[PDB]
Amino acid sequence: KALSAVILAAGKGTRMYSDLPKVLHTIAGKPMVKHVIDTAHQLGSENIHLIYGHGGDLMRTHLANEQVNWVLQTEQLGTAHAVQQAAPFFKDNENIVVLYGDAPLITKETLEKLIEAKPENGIALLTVNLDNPTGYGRIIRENGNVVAIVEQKDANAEQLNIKEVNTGVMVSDGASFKKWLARVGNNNAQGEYYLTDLIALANQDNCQVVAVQATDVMEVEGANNRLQLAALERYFQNKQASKLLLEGVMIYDPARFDLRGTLEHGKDVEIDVNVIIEGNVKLGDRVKIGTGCVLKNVVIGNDVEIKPYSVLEDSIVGEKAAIGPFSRLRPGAELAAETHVGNFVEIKKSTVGKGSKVNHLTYVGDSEIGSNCNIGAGVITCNYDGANKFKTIIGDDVFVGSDTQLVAPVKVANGATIGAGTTITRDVGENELVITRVAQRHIQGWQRPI
Amino acid sequence: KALSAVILAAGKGTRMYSDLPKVLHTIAGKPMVKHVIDTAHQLGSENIHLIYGHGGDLMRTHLANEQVNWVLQTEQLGTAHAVQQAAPFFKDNENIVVLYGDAPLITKETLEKLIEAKPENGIALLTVNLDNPTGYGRIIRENGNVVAIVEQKDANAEQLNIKEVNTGVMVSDGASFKKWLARVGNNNAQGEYYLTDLIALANQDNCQVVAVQATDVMEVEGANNRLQLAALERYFQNKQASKLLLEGVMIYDPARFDLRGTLEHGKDVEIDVNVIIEGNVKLGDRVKIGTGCVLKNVVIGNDVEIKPYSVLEDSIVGEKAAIGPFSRLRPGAELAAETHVGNFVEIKKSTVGKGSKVNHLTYVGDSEIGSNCNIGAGVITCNYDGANKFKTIIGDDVFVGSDTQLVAPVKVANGATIGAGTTITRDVGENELVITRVAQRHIQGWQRPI
Amino acid sequence: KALSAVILAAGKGTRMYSDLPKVLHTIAGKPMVKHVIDTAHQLGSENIHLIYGHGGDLMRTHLANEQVNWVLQTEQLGTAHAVQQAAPFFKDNENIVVLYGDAPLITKETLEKLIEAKPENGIALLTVNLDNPTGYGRIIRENGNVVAIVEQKDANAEQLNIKEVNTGVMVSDGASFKKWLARVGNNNAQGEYYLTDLIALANQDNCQVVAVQATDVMEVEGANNRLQLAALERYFQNKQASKLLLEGVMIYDPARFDLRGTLEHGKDVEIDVNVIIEGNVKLGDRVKIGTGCVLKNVVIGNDVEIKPYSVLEDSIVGEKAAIGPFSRLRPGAELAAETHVGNFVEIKKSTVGKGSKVNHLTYVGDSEIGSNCNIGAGVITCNYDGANKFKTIIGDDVFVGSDTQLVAPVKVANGATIGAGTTITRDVGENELVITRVAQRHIQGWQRPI
Ligand SMILES: O=C1CCN(c2cccc([N+](=O)[O-])c2)C(=O)N1
Ligand SMILES: O=C1CCN(c2cccc([N+](=O)[O-])c2)C(=O)N1
Ligand SMILES: O=C1CCN(c2cccc([N+](=O)[O-])c2)C(=O)N1
Ligand SMILES: [Mg+2]
Ligand SMILES: [Mg+2]
């Protein structure tokens, strides 16, 4: 049977105290609503109906590329009213799962189980057991099926001790949604049209409502403020870390590890404390990451060691390379196999060839460096004033003496040797030695002012 | 009714294994006793009587500016004896609250409630419920009021199961303190004069003793060693973080956030993991702080992003500025709006004008830099030998080529251009171009030793 | 009575998903099996019989220097079979303690207590109380002694509620081991020879089996995968941190502190969050370590402050020195008393004399620097091409101007002064002033392209 999703995301999120609407705040680097959209897609949803309202323009800009049907809800008259805005687009004989944009941790596995348990022409309701269920609607079962959701203020002493409560997440066919939504009223203290009332309406029609318990309480938790959001973040990171640990990644402390994207890994990977992995990251076999590193959108080959406090982005590092500590790889940094990048070195939009070393106090930008080069401490690639970031081309087996400035556009051919303290503006030929002639004044018997 | 405070702080703190006396060890960057003094001041205390003893000279130096009455207790003969040293200074018809210098987490709100509950000519006693009350004096209530504090060794089976215990924190009027303190004896296993005995003496005089429970167990906890102190630190930081989160500050992980002072914030502020905020810090709207940053006594304007592993102190940063990663702002660094400071850059006691950039491997000290300047990689401001840190003055729209040394005292006027590898000792005029004439030796066919 | 140990370490550790065998994965920087070997040595074990199998060659290379008897178990036919491989080497009247290489947290104190409780010709069995004992063999006591270990599948309702279970850790004399091991069969669902069966065999011979409870559940926990290993790591670090805190080390957050080796400390030492201590580290009195530092094999004198994000290895720092932030000490760095090393400075295999300062953007390698020297920002020690890392010798009271290159081999004698931007290739004499003669072209009225 086909499937489509409805995601409620119209909320202002007042207690976030933000200019953003509620569902755009991030978990693991990605909006809460994007998590739910992805999960909806994982389930094989044909359509995803996004009910939006507050911060409409921001929603549109932040989620511009998402494959969803944009359903504007001008007035927040209740969860049933929200879902009914998308109802005209429901296929009569597809299943519809209702999800909430502020509850990002809900898993595919739990939702697959919910959908499977849905009886024909009936409802599958996602429930959860709370140790303190105070305030939530209690699930009343009579011979396997949900006959009522009894609210806190209505429940008797016996019912108050029921720990199983309603989450509001549910599945039913499109025809049934269209039918029952038109029959939901707002005769209550809040004057709202509640999706909850579908359970009563289903029982009225002698249609079966089946309860399906969520395994994890936190999986169905929503975030109404940033304290709650921080709790979801930590639960999520702990779970990501646990999975990686069971896959054989050595994470020294999973409470001090953050993944904000996707990690692909080989075997015997070691990640020390306080590492942050962002975007799409790939690590080969036996990669070692030291404390305090940040990797965003990088590919790291086999047997690479990244030493502490290194920051890498949009970069590629070949096998057996050595990076850090205190190294900076900026976008377009491409390090070949067996290369070396050391402390207080910045590499931007440059390729560095096999075996080459750049180990101290150096800036290399917009450059091509060949194989087995020695880039001395203090070397800087620079431009003339008013230039448009021109390129420095360094061949193979070149020695560049310490504290030399390479002034682009310039080429240094294979086997060239450049002395310390040189200013290179003209191209250097193959096997050309360039050394600076210094003039110095020597004054003997100069007593220092001490 | 007026109020004054007495703070017991005479302890050696032997189990700290320190040359400091007990109450000078810090929580959130500030001595335990200073927390209590501040809380006493928040309550509107007219006088604060500080009972001190061990490490007297250190107490005097560390708390020199505190508005307290210094009451020296030469012998630690007990809590009642301690309080009686300050008693001659009690006003007969002011309230007196007794606090302990090693219990820094006690809140104003709890103490206001304690004072409010104090019956005329009676005592208000702060109590706390412990799940394991073993060792502590059990509170015995007979019709709403405290009739006895029964110690562990005296209590019967029934009383041993009482979970409410005595904290020793109490409020009574000055006249009553003077009266009852003179009647406290030391006939006990320890030979000490216990403040606890005031409850018995109050009941003797048919004066009412009212119990007031503390909401948080940790709020009344003292620290006798550094393990306990670390527990108070974490409880305190968690509470500070929680408050900020509910105020709308996005703290990615509140377990990896430290505030040691005061934070003023706008809306939509984002703070990544392992950030430390010290002294008085102010952040505008939409400030983003990356992982590993340290901010001490800084003002940060709207829309500033501070990238990872940046350390800033006694500095000001204008709106839309970009700092980091690996940036160092030392005291007196003043960055205007829309400025840029990059990796491995150190700025000390300098002003940098709007739009200017200092992006790599640079030291700027004792300088004024104007607007829209380009400070190249490797640039260093320096002095002659035996100088007294003289100033470098750089005007507006100046280009300083990479690896140039600026030798103070020197001025570079508006629109000047300085070539790479230059040593500037003489003033540079408006629209003056200064380039270094290099002499180089070129040797062709130099085969490298490889 | 003499003592020897047997350590079971033959396991593949399949669920680690590693090329290493199970017991070589590290806790606190050291293989799990090495922890157990050290503990065995602490007890005064005469021989340590290491039962190994999978990853034999890796075990041999990683533990090459360990004083153990290498006992190869070609087939893992069970714990009794494992121990019997070492049995021929047991002395008849020495005690033998059996330990597991994947359970590294077992303490000397617990094992001393186990051995003490061993009755003559009997067995001492280490047991532990679990809240959920499901799956583990229940200890059956009849008048003080263990009469049976009843497995999950055999136990009756009453026995299932027994919380005390078997750990497999046990002590008995060598003669008794030889006797009973020969009588262990493999008639069970797994077809394995279980060491557990010694308890039945002991009771058969009317020999006493005494239960000794472990105080900490985690102390006897093994790690079968990296998630479990991470849990052992955190328990271990928490325990190390707690001990240091009770000894008087101020650890700001013990959940963000890692010791991977041994720490020797004085009084009033302060360690901020996210510090890693590796190898053998010694800190004097009043040492302050700022956030993010890494210290590996270092000696730090009294009153040293190490500021944030400093990385030190195989180095010595004299009293009252100031290091950091962003300082790098590489192996062989020897800093005298009252020295200063600042941000973006790298010191390798060099000695730096009393009072000298190296405060910015500098590399010093293979050098000797005397007392009260001023090493300016941007200074770099370097070599000629094809050199073998020659030495730079700087005397006392030398001023080296900013951005100067020192080209080894070279000597600069006492009291010399070197101007900024100099290239030093020739030796500098006592009280010699060396300044660079720059040639510059000045072009007036150069309008920048803006
Ligand atoms: O009328 C309503 C009821 C509330 N609702 C809503 C329900 C749950 C979550 C969110 N949200 O994440 O913003 C919104 C809606 O979207 N519309
Ligand atoms: O005689 C005494 C009893 C103990 N006492 C005391 C009581 C509580 C806390 C501290 N302190 O924080 O140091 C001291 C005193 O100050 N004096
Ligand atoms: O036949 C056997 C039983 C299993 N065993 C074994 C038992 C416990 C722990 C380990 N280990 O840490 O690898 C191995 C062995 O060493 N041999
Ligand atoms: Mg330089
Ligand atoms: Mg230079």
PDB file of N, CA and C in Angstrom, chain C residues 18 28 46-47 59 75 82-83 123 125 181 199 204 213-214 285 288 322 339 346 420 424-425 440 449:
ATOM      1  N   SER C  18      38.454  -5.417  14.404  1.00  0.00           N
ATOM      2  CA  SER C  18      39.817  -4.905  14.405  1.00  0.00           C
ATOM      3  C   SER C  18      40.797  -5.962  13.927  1.00  0.00           C
ATOM      4  N   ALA C  28      43.266   3.984  28.975  1.00  0.00           N
ATOM      5  CA  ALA C  28      44.189   5.004  29.474  1.00  0.00           C
ATOM      6  C   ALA C  28      45.570   4.901  28.820  1.00  0.00           C
ATOM      7  N   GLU C  46      55.209 -14.256  41.369  1.00  0.00           N
ATOM      8  CA  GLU C  46      56.538 -14.764  41.037  1.00  0.00           C
ATOM      9  C   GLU C  46      56.627 -15.050  39.542  1.00  0.00           C
ATOM     10  N   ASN C  47      55.623 -15.753  39.023  1.00  0.00           N
ATOM     11  CA  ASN C  47      55.474 -15.954  37.587  1.00  0.00           C
ATOM     12  C   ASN C  47      54.130 -15.414  37.120  1.00  0.00           C
ATOM     13  N   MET C  59      50.721  -9.759  19.609  1.00  0.00           N
ATOM     14  CA  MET C  59      50.898  -9.854  21.059  1.00  0.00           C
ATOM     15  C   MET C  59      52.386  -9.801  21.408  1.00  0.00           C
ATOM     16  N   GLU C  75      44.059 -24.015  20.369  1.00  0.00           N
ATOM     17  CA  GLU C  75      42.607 -24.146  20.248  1.00  0.00           C
ATOM     18  C   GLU C  75      41.933 -23.629  21.511  1.00  0.00           C
ATOM     19  N   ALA C  82      42.453 -23.526  28.835  1.00  0.00           N
ATOM     20  CA  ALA C  82      43.411 -22.424  28.814  1.00  0.00           C
ATOM     21  C   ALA C  82      44.355 -22.483  30.017  1.00  0.00           C
ATOM     22  N   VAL C  83      43.780 -22.554  31.214  1.00  0.00           N
ATOM     23  CA  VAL C  83      44.566 -22.592  32.448  1.00  0.00           C
ATOM     24  C   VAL C  83      45.448 -23.846  32.519  1.00  0.00           C
ATOM     25  N   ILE C 123      39.320 -23.191  47.651  1.00  0.00           N
ATOM     26  CA  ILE C 123      39.241 -22.160  46.624  1.00  0.00           C
ATOM     27  C   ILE C 123      38.647 -20.872  47.193  1.00  0.00           C
ATOM     28  N   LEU C 125      36.661 -17.724  45.624  1.00  0.00           N
ATOM     29  CA  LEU C 125      35.969 -17.306  44.410  1.00  0.00           C
ATOM     30  C   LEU C 125      35.529 -15.850  44.520  1.00  0.00           C
ATOM     31  N   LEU C 181      41.892 -29.709  37.359  1.00  0.00           N
ATOM     32  CA  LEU C 181      41.856 -29.405  35.918  1.00  0.00           C
ATOM     33  C   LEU C 181      41.805 -30.676  35.069  1.00  0.00           C
ATOM     34  N   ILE C 199      34.589 -25.596  41.174  1.00  0.00           N
ATOM     35  CA  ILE C 199      33.817 -25.414  42.401  1.00  0.00           C
ATOM     36  C   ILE C 199      33.072 -26.702  42.751  1.00  0.00           C
ATOM     37  N   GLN C 204      33.130 -31.901  45.742  1.00  0.00           N
ATOM     38  CA  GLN C 204      33.293 -33.357  45.629  1.00  0.00           C
ATOM     39  C   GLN C 204      34.393 -33.890  46.546  1.00  0.00           C
ATOM     40  N   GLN C 213      33.181 -11.043  47.833  1.00  0.00           N
ATOM     41  CA  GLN C 213      32.489 -10.088  46.971  1.00  0.00           C
ATOM     42  C   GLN C 213      33.406  -8.950  46.542  1.00  0.00           C
ATOM     43  N   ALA C 214      33.295  -8.559  45.275  1.00  0.00           N
ATOM     44  CA  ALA C 214      33.962  -7.361  44.778  1.00  0.00           C
ATOM     45  C   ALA C 214      33.129  -6.145  45.180  1.00  0.00           C
ATOM     46  N   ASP C 285      54.805  22.622  42.757  1.00  0.00           N
ATOM     47  CA  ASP C 285      53.789  23.365  43.508  1.00  0.00           C
ATOM     48  C   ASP C 285      53.234  24.520  42.681  1.00  0.00           C
ATOM     49  N   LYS C 288      49.766  25.888  37.146  1.00  0.00           N
ATOM     50  CA  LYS C 288      48.445  26.137  36.576  1.00  0.00           C
ATOM     51  C   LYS C 288      48.441  25.709  35.114  1.00  0.00           C
ATOM     52  N   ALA C 322      56.680  30.869  31.954  1.00  0.00           N
ATOM     53  CA  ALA C 322      55.357  31.153  31.414  1.00  0.00           C
ATOM     54  C   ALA C 322      55.280  30.612  29.989  1.00  0.00           C
ATOM     55  N   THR C 339      61.580  31.739  32.136  1.00  0.00           N
ATOM     56  CA  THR C 339      61.556  31.926  30.690  1.00  0.00           C
ATOM     57  C   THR C 339      60.131  32.211  30.220  1.00  0.00           C
ATOM     58  N   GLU C 346      57.245  27.432  18.254  1.00  0.00           N
ATOM     59  CA  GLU C 346      57.625  26.027  18.231  1.00  0.00           C
ATOM     60  C   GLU C 346      59.085  25.917  18.679  1.00  0.00           C
ATOM     61  N   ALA C 420      66.274  43.859  12.812  1.00  0.00           N
ATOM     62  CA  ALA C 420      65.136  43.189  12.188  1.00  0.00           C
ATOM     63  C   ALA C 420      65.391  42.882  10.711  1.00  0.00           C
ATOM     64  N   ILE C 424      71.394  35.862   9.086  1.00  0.00           N
ATOM     65  CA  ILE C 424      72.674  35.602   9.750  1.00  0.00           C
ATOM     66  C   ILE C 424      73.252  34.265   9.283  1.00  0.00           C
ATOM     67  N   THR C 425      74.374  34.333   8.566  1.00  0.00           N
ATOM     68  CA  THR C 425      75.106  33.145   8.117  1.00  0.00           C
ATOM     69  C   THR C 425      76.505  33.037   8.736  1.00  0.00           C
ATOM     70  N   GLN C 440      65.697  50.618  -1.035  1.00  0.00           N
ATOM     71  CA  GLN C 440      64.272  50.763  -1.305  1.00  0.00           C
ATOM     72  C   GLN C 440      64.040  51.752  -2.435  1.00  0.00           C
ATOM     73  N   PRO C 449      44.884  50.901  -6.841  1.00  0.00           N
ATOM     74  CA  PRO C 449      43.757  50.529  -7.693  1.00  0.00           C
ATOM     75  C   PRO C 449      42.485  50.271  -6.880  1.00  0.00           C
TER      76      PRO C 449
END
